[PDB]
Amino acid sequence: PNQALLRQLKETEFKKIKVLGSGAFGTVYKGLWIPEGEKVKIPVAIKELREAKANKEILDEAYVMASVDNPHVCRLLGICLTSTVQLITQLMPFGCLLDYVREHKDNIGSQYLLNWCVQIAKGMNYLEDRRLVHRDLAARNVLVKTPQHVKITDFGLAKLKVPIKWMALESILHRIYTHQSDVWSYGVTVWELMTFGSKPYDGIPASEISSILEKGERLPQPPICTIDVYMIMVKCWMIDADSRPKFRELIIEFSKMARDPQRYLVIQGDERMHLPSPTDSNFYRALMDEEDMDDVVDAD
């Protein structure tokens, strides 16, 4: 494990400026990094974990989080260990994908929806290749770097209030977490995207979820989803973990759909919605996204 990928910060080097939100593991702040001797203030994201393990143990798993290198996975950049644990990552002005699809509920075309599914599956496939299990995949944990480029965040924060409605049944009943339970959570994530950010099992108590799942009930077909798309989601929620799709296969299936998007999603006014022109993509990347990344899938 290359320790050069993780910078240890002193509390004087940075400052938390504004709360962006919180979850089961901590509170996220927009912050500023001031490099020693410089007068510039560089925006960063800072997550202060709630618990506040020995430092060496934490630091050991931080190195792993800092070692991920994939265009669709957020890398841990720095850490500050004191009376609390603070994690430094790149700040994402657009915020999480869950908020984004809610705010653009009437502006989002099939090409974006299907490409996001592809990118999320690419990020998860990379984690599986690293033999790393996420355990907390959800639309709230996908960040928008640009509308054309999303990234998975917060994998393995357990190491270092359980999300029952995203969890595989075997995780609920037995706290077993695997790549195939990550696939279940991927299914729920895709459902959140396709419903433009609806809450899964709305109005149903968390305590009743396992019995509902055992009865064979699942999240309902989203109004924009054709049966082929919905069957993929349903396959992610099969009781037998090994009969669920693999992330490798999901990349291929959603990439195929992205090439003929109106055949797979039905969205009012979809023809009036395209992926950005080369001109607009070039501008976005120049200003916000210089990193390398696979081409988005365009319609045939």
Q: Which does 89 bind (CB under 5 to 8 A by kind): Mg ion, ligand ANP, none?
A: ligand ANP
Q: Residue type for 12, please? A: T
Min. distance of Cβ 75 from ligand ANP in angstroms? 11
Judge whether 24 is annotated as a binding position.
Answer: yes
From the list 69, 129, 136, 228, the catalytic residue is 136
Q: Which of 48, 128, 154, 192 binds Mg ion (CB under 5 A)?
A: 154
Q: Which does 20 bind (CB under 5 to 8 A by kind): Mg ion, ligand ANP, none?
A: ligand ANP
**Is 73 within 8 Å of 141 (Cβ atoms)?**
no
Min. distance of Cβ 98 from ligand ANP in angstroms? 7
Instruction: Say what the alpha-carbon torsion angle 47, 53, 55, 56 is, to the nearest 10 degrees.
Output: -120
Q: Which does 148 bind (CB under 5 to 8 A by kind): Mg ion, ligand ANP, none?
A: none
How far apart are alpha carbons 30 and 130 in whole angstroms? 29
Q: Which of 13, 32, 49, 95 binds ligand ANP (CB under 6 A)?
A: 95
- For Mg ion, the binding residues in 116-145 under the rule CB under 5 A are 141
How far apart are alpha carbons 99 and 19 in whole angstroms? 16
Q: Residue type for 141, please? A: N
Q: Which does 139 bind (CB under 5 to 8 A by kind): ligand ANP, Mg ion, none?
A: none
How far apart are alpha carbons 237 and 244 in whole angstroms? 7
How far apart are alpha carbons 199 and 130 in whole angstroms? 31
Task: Let me know the angle formed at the C-alpha of 79 by 84 and 176, rounded to the nearest 5 degrees.
Answer: 80
Min. distance of Cβ 223 from Mg ion in angstroms? 27
User: Could you say which DSSP state residue 130 is in?
Assistant: T
Strand partners, 69: none
Binding site for Mg ion (CB under 5 A): 23, 141, 154
Binding site for ligand ANP (CB under 6 A): 20-26, 28, 45, 47, 89, 91-92, 95-96, 99, 136, 138, 140-141, 143, 153-154, 163
List residues with catalytic annotation: 136
Q: Pick out the residues of the known binding site for ATP.
A: 20-28, 47, 89-90, 154
